[PDB]
Amino acid sequence: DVVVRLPDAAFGVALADAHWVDKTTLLWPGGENKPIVRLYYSHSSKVAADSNGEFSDKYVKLTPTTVNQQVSMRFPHLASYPAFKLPDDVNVDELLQGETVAIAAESDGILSSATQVQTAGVLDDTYAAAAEALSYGAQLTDSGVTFRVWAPTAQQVELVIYSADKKVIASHPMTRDSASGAWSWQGGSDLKGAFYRYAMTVYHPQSRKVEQYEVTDPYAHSLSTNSEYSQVVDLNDSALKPEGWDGLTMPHAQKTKADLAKMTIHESHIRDLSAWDQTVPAELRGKYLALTAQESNMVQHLKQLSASGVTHIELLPVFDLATVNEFSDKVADIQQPFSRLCEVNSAVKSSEFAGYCDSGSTVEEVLTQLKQNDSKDNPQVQALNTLVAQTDSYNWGYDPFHYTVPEGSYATDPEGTARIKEFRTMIQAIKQDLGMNVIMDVVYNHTNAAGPTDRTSVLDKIVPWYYQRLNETTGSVESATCCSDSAPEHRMFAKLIADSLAVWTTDYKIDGFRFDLMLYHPKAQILSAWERIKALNPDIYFFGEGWDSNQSDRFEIASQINLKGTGIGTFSDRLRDAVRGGGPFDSGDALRQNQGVGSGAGVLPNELTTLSDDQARHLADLTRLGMAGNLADFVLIDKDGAVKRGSEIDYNGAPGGYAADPTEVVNYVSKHDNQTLWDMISYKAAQEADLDTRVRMQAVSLATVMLGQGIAFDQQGSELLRSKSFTRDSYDSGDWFNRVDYSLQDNNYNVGMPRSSDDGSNYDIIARVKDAVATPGETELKQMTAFYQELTALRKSSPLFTLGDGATVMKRVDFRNTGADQQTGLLVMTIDDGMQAGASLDSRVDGIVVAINAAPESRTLQDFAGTSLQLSAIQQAAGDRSLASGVQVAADGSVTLPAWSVAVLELPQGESQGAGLPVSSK
Numbered sequence: 071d072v073v074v075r076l077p078d079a080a081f082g083v084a085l086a087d088a089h090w091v092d093k094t095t096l097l098w099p100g101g102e103n104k105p106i107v108r109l110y111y112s113h114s115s116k117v118a119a120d121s122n123g124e125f126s127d128k129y130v131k132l133t134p135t136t137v138n139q140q141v142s143m144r145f146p147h148l149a150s151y152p153a154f155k156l157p158d159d160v161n162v163d164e165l166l167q168g169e170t171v172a173i174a175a176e177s178d179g180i181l182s183s184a185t186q187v188q189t190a191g192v193l194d195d196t197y198a199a200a201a202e203a204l205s206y207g208a209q210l211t212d213s214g215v216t217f218r219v220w221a222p223t224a225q226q227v228e229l230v231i232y233s234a235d236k237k238v239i240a241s242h243p244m245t246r247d248s249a250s251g252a253w254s255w256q257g258g259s260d261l262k263g264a265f266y267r268y269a270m271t272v273y274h275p276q277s278r279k280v281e282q283y284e285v286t287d288p289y290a291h292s293l294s295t296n297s298e299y300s301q302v303v304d305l306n307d308s309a310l311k312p313e314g315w316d317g318l319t320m321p322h323a324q325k326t327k328a329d330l331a332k333m334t335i336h337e338s339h340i341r342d343l344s345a346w347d348q349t350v351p352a353e354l355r356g357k358y359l360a361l362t363a364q365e366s367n368m369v370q371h372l373k374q375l376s377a378s379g380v381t382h383i384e385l386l387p388v389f390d391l392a393t394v395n396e397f398s399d400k401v402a403d404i405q406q407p408f409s410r411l412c413e414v415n416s417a418v419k420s421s422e423f424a425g426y427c428d429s430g431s432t433v434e435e436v437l438t439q440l441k442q443n444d445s446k447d448n449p450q451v452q453a454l455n456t457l458v459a460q461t462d463s464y465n466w467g468y469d470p471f472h473y474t475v476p477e478g479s480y481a482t483d484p485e486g487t488a489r490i491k492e493f494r495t496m497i498q499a500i501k502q503d504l505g506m507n508v509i510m511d512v513v514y515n516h517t518n519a520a521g522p523t524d525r526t527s528v529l530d531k532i533v534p535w536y537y538q539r540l541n542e543t544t545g546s547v548e549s550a551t552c553c554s555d556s557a558p559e560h561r562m563f564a565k566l567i568a569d570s571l572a573v574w575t576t577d578y579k580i581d582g583f584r585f586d587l588m589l590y591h592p593k594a595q596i597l598s599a600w601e602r603i604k605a606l607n608p609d610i611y612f613f614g615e616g617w618d619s620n621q622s623d624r625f626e627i628a629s630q631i632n633l634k635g636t637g638i639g640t641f642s643d644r645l646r647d648a649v650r651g652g653g654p655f656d657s658g659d660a661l662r663q664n665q666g667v668g669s670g671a672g673v674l675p676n677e678l679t680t681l682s683d684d685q686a687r688h689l690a691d692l693t694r695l696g697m698a699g700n701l702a703d704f705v706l707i708d709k710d711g712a713v714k715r716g717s718e719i720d721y722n723g724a725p726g727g728y729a730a731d732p733t734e735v736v737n738y739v740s741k742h743d744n745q746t747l748w749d750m751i752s753y754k755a756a757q758e759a760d761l762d763t764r765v766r767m768q769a770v771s772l773a774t775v776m777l778g779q780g781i782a783f784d785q786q787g788s789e790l791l792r793s794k795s796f797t798r799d800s801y802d803s804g805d806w807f808n809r810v811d812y813s814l815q816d817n818n819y820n821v822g823m824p825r826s827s828d829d830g831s832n833y834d835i836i837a838r839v840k841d842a843v844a845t846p847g848e849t850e851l852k853q854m855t856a857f858y859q860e861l862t863a864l865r866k867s868s869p870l871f872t873l874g875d876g877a878t879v880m881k882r883v884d885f886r887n888t889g890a891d892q893q894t895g896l897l898v899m900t901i902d903d904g905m906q907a908g909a910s911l912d913s914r915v916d917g918i919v920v921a922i923n924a925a926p927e928s929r930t931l932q933d934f935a936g937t938s939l940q941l942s943a944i945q946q947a948a949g950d951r952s953l954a955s956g957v958q959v960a961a962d963g964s965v966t967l968p969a970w971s972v973a974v975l976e977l978p979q980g981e982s983q984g985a986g987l988p989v990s991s992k
């Protein structure tokens with residue numbers, strides 16, 4: 071065998087485009103048409119030509135071959151690479167212990183290329199099955215405890231035990247299982263509560279070095295402050311459970327599709343909820359336990375929302391996030407002295423705000439004073455707040471540190487197991503006292519960091535290049551998610567995800583999960599996870615969002631269309647965009663030009679828009695389709711009088727309706743990301759639309775969601791006309807811009823120009839529309855909350871609003887005021903319960919009519935003449951505070967609706983089922 075040598079820098083190892091996908095297959099474009107193709111390896115050293123310019127390291131001979139069908143299906147995106155075969159006698163385990171490098175040279179031996187090797191594929195093929203059959207983490211049983219961590223490429227792994235004061239009390243070399251590649255150590259039950267970390271000795275391809283470092287348990291179920299050490303815990307311990315925990319039941323059913331359809335979500339954040347509530351005990355503000363302060367404005371508010379129809383609370387990241395320091399002395403919040411901020415934040419101390427350091431004001435008081443002179447030319451509020459955000463307690467938390475441990479900063483005591491009971495106490499309070507189910511936001515699509523050096527890199531330190539998705543040529547961790555893209559298509563990560571969800575389900579009694587960027591997950595993986603969880607809780611609900619994956623080349627993604635008929639819900643952006651207007655990418659003038667159905671598209675144009683009546687009627691089509699569950703097979707009459715199925719209604723080049731059942735669709739017009747509903751209406755509302763009209767626009771926008779068949783979802787505060795002062799992405803904009811005032815003084819609008827880094831290009835349009843009308847005050851907030859509760863109350867007032875089954879929707883739901891002769895902005899939906907619909911689902915009525923007049927004109931409906939239509943008792947009871955205030959039902963049967971109004975009419979059921987409102991044949 072000729073000796074590979076350099077030509078007798080540009081000939082040294084470069085890139086990492088070689089892929090060791092299975093025991094005997096290596097896919098690499100470098101050895102193509104090359105005479106000498108080898109796979110060099112070194113246990114403890116780095117391959118490199120010796121001084122003699124020769125690569126005198128051990129290797130295996132690679133022979134050209136064709137990619138098998140097994141590898142082709144597993145990695146479609148690699149099926150194109152030149153395939154190479156390894157001898158069937160090579161010691162895979164031995165080579166995986168160190169560095170492997172693919173080298174190609176000419177017949178004469180001179181090197182032509184050398185590259186690092188990606189081994190995730192061979193890792194699964196070799197150890198996955200065996201490793202999948204085992205359980206991980208610090209498992210505390212009756213006989214004692216068993217620690218287990220998967221580290222198939224590590225040369226050494228030691229279990230390091232620490233005392234409460236964090237002194238090493240023992241370092242145990244673990245036992246490696248040859249079949250699985252997992253390491254374990256069994257001890258006595260006295261290790262309960264002990265802190266620990268795994269001391270790793272493993273080769274990391276990014277640094278090309280056998281690293282030595284201690285890492286927390288990715289299966290950690292308890293942690294020390296700021297997640298520095300994992301901790302042994304038995305979640306079953308009654309000491310970690312609030313009184314009566316085991317008997318906690320779901321206040322709302324989620325068994326049948328009809329049950330699921332009634333879901334009405336309120337997306338909340340732990341600090342957003344209580345950070346500003348002075349009626350919440352000071353020590354609980356921004357904490358899980360704030361939910362237990364029954365006499366506070368916040369809790370009382372949520373209680374009333376629940377009583378009125380809100381069924382679920384969805385929590386932004388409450389798993390262990392990385393972007394908030396849990397050591398209180400390293401943190402400074404706006405309610406504290408500016409002097410504290412200067413001592414914990416050196417950036418502030420060296421800024422133009424340094425002069426406030428020895429002042430006697432709180433940061434909050436300083437921010438308040440900076441408001442008067444704040445403008446697009448002097449955005450001083452955000453300037454100061456941007457420095458504040460670096461060391462405060464605020465962050466949405468979409469930055470996974472540990473997937474199966476509650477976040478520590480939201481606990482009154484972040485050290486050890488304490489947070490576990492506090493978290494459960496909150497869950498119990500929400501379900502038992504507030505009467506709402508709980509949904510958790512999960513972020514398995516990425517990790518906070520990767521590599522062998524970052525503090526928050528956990529998974530990529532233990533099994534390098536396995537848990538992260540890498541670029542096919544460079545080996546670099548991709549960041550399409552934002553951060554460190556994970557690899558759910560890899561078996562052991564899929565298992566980690568499922569095992570994690572099992573704990574949140576069983577041990578924390580979470581009722582549902584919302585997957586962040588779910589389309590970055592293989593459809594097969596999401597479904598497998600659901601199958602495993604349904605075994606634990608048959609009624610658990612899974613849903614997610616995203617819509618910009620780009621991973622189709624690697625596997626079938628969990629997208630809106632691919633999930634059709636699976637029962638997995640997905641946020642629908644169809645009705646969202648049609649009602650809000652425009653899209654998430656809009657900036658500058660487009661923000662004002664792109665009005666939506668909820669802001670007067672076509673019927674009440676602002677001075678910049680160019681929207682045509684046809685474009686406005688198209689949005690109405692998307693809106694009606696959404697109110698009917700955004701079904702692919704739902705039949706309606708479009709803006710041109712044409713008979714169309716939901717899938718035929720275009721949505722920016724994609725088929726609008728995609729679902730099989732309304733329970734697979736989550737409608738919404740506001741969410742944590744992107745501008746709040748109120749800020750969008752402020753950007754879009756015509757100058758002449760007065761304050762009272764804008765409040766009704768907010769209610770009308772929300773009416774399309776609440777009175778629709780899809781699952782209803784809304785952002786915490788929409789009922790309060792919540793504003794973020796135009797901030798589009800407020801994930802790190804602190805308490806200041808994310809403020810929700812449960813004392814009802816204002817909606818946090820106009821409290822300074824938003825962050826310049828992200829909204830700077832919008833300062834011009836903001837200054838132009840910001841002061842159009844007055845800032846909502848207590849009168850407006852109370853009026854909106856009333857409108858909001860009226861809507862949620864109407865949604866649960868009849869099972870006809872939440873049919874659940876797609877076929878049933880098609881059999882009962884229809885629309886009026888459609889076609890080319892339609893009155894723009896008037897949405898009229900009928901729901902049948904008459905003889906022709908089948909069984910009577912509502913003993914009180916034979917049918918319901920939902921009329922939403924999103925227009926500055928009064929509209930008269932003649933469709934139901936002689937039908938004896940009556941206004942809903944719920945709206946009648948609201949009198950002139952109703953969204954239906956002013957509605958009139960004449961003697962003949964015609965109905966007149968005032969501008970910007972919403973009316974729910976009904977056909978009182980007689981002695982027997984009546985004619986109802988049969989769906990018209992099309």
Ligand SMILES: OC[C@H]1O[C@H](OC[C@H]2O[C@@H](O)[C@H](O)[C@@H](O)[C@@H]2O)[C@H](O)[C@@H](O)[C@@H]1O
Pocket residue numbers: 466467468469550551552553586587616743799801
């Ligand atoms: O902290 C990281 C990241 O958090 C926030 O984004 C989270 C996800 O938000 C979705 O709306 C978006 O589609 C995804 O791509 C994001 O991962 C925050 O908005 C962002 O600025 C931060 O980088």
Ligand SMILES: [Ca+2]
Pocket residue numbers: 296297390391392393394396471477478479
């Ligand atoms: Ca944390």
Ligand SMILES: [Ca+2]
Pocket residue numbers: 458459460461462463464465802804
């Ligand atoms: Ca912050």
Ligand SMILES: [Ca+2]
Pocket residue numbers: 620621
């Ligand atoms: Ca890609």
Ligand SMILES: [Ca+2]
Pocket residue numbers: 903910911912913914915916917979
């Ligand atoms: Ca009936």
